Structure formats: structure tokens, C-alpha cells
Write a protein that binds this ligand. Structure first.
Ligand code: ZRV
Length: 155
């Protein structure tokens, strides 16, 4: 039972994607999607919506399941079971929160050098609209020791 539920939301429009520069906590100094820990008493999809609203002020009509990524950190007992979602249908204008500074990127200008190193592997599958299952084992925030990645028909 040693896994913890997380969400990660990508706002993907036909010619741009929304990311946020993380200002504090894990992944600070990287362009992240919007997400975090799923709480007691909410569904995974409601956690995804709650994280998106807290970090960007955005609400959404619909969120689509696009992937699952399991992260393992050496010395951390809980695996992080990240449910990844996509939306085109955003409600509102993204605004800066305490945690995140939102910015739109063109799909050929993805800032991979200032992103989590795992993004170079799985994020292209999200942009290519393929559903995926990923696993990445980290030693600290910079070093991938092992990984798996595949496409799936069901997230
Ligand atoms: C005791 C609890 C553990 C303390 N540390 C953590 O909480 C923690 C450490 C790291 C990560 C983590 C986040 C990632 C991450 N962002 C993320 C993921 C889930 C929830 C929120 C943001 C991305 C991402 O945003 N990619 C861009 C294309 C969209 C990519 N790779 C990631 C790898 C990671 F390992 C998440 C955490 F929650």
C-alpha cells in the first residue's frame, strides 16, 4: 500500500500549453504543470481541479485522463502515483499564485532545460495525444537512475 495519490494538469490548446514557474517547495525553479497531493474526501479528478484553481485561478468544463507516472525517490517510503490530466476548455485568465507564475509556451518552444528531467521522456507523448504509463526513479531532484515508459489504450 506504499503509494500516495497526486494529480498533474496540463492546459493544452491547439498551438500552446500552459506551464507555471514553481516559486517554492519541490520543483522550485522549474516549469511545472498544476497539481499536488489528493486529499481525504475528494476524488482524484476533483483534487486535479482544486490544484488547478489554487495555483492558476482557472476552472475547467472537462478534464481528460492522459497518463499515469509513478515516481520513486531513494530514501522516500511512499511512491508518488501521479494521475495526469489534460484540458483545452479553460474558464478564466491564468493568474500568478504564491506557488506558481503561469506562462503560455508554443508547442515547439517547450522549456525542457528548465523542466523536470523526466519531462523530456513523457511530455512529448502528452503533446502527441498518446496515453502513457511512466515510472521514474530519482536520486535527489536532478538524477534519473531508472525509468520505464509505454503507451497504453486505457489510463
Ligand atoms: C514526502 C512527500 C514527497 C516530497 N516531495 C514532493 O512532494 C514531490 C517531489 C517531486 C515531484 C515531482 C513533480 C514533477 C512534476 N510536477 C508535479 C507533479 C505532481 C504534482 C505536482 C507537480 C513534473 C511536471 O510538472 N512536468 C511538467 C510537464 C508538466 C514532472 N516531473 C515531476 C517529478 C517529480 F518527482 C512531486 C512531488 F510532490
Amino acid at each position: 500500500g506504499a503509494s500516495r495519490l497526486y494529480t498533474l494538469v496540463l492546459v493544452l490548446q491547439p498551438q500552446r500549453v500552459l506551464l507555471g514557474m514553481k516559486k517554492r517547495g519541490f520543483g522550485a525553479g522549474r516549469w511545472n504543470g498544476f497539481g499536488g497531493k489528493v486529499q481525504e474526501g475528494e476524488t482524484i479528478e476533483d483534487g486535479a481541479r482544486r490544484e488547478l484553481q489554487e495555483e492558476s485561478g482557472l476552472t475547467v468544463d472537462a478534464l481528460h485522463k492522459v497518463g499515469q507516472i509513478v515516481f520513486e525517490f531513494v530514501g522516500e517510503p511512499e511512491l508518488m502515483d501521479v494521475h495526469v490530466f489534460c484540458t483545452d476548455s479553460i474558464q478564466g485568465t491564468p493568474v500568478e499564485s504564491d506557488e506558481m507564475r503561469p506562462c503560455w509556451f508554443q508547442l515547439d518552444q517547450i522549456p525542457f532545460k528548465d523542466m523536470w528531467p523526466d519531462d523530456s521522456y513523457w511530455f512529448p507523448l502528452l503533446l502527441q495525444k498518446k496515453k502513457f504509463h511512466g515510472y521514474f526513479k530519482f536520486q535527489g531532484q536532478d538524477t534519473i537512475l531508472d525509468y520505464t515508459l509505454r503507451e497504453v489504450d486505457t489510463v
